[PDB]
Amino acid sequence: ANIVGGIEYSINNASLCSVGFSVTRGATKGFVTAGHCGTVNATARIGGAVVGTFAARVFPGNDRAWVSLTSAQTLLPRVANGSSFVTVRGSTEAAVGAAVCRSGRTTGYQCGTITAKNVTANYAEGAVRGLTQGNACMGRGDSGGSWITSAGQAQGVMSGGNVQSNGNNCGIPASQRSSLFERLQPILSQYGLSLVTG
């Protein structure tokens, strides 16, 4: 399969999440995603085919993971925006106030701004600290998906947010949204990963 940020993948033929970013670890191909999406060794599938397994994850506390892919997979420096693509050019972290977008299999490509950093989320499993908050909307299933600026700077992966009864927070104003992502930089260094760029 072609690995693009924002696309759907399943975990152990059960839960669905979204791809964060194509990365390499030496000769090994992979993609970063959210830790809550799967446990170590869990099988990832795209288009009905096995593409790899969860190599490592930290959740709760943090919310990160990377899926180690088979060499048959095709890594791409891109994030889905409708039928088009946003090129991944680097991982410069944007400041509070910056515009930012996210991509996922539930709500697609959504944009907003970064409103706060170092935010704690109290999830069912425990607290996750150090998350960055934006007001682009999201929904259940967008988890693990790419957060990236229009200029191509990869920011992080979708962790969680204040989803309403309809499963997303797109039906409430941006001012009331808390959409949280796990910063990309600590994921890359923790697992010795290099972002695939173009």
UniProtKB/Swiss-Prot annotation:
Top-level lineage group: Bacteria
Cystine bridges: 17-37, 101-111, 137-170
Positions annotated as active site in the UniProt record: 36, 63, 143
Family: Belongs to the peptidase S1 family.
Name assigned to this protein: Alpha-lytic protease
Coverage span on the entire protein: 200 to 397 of 397
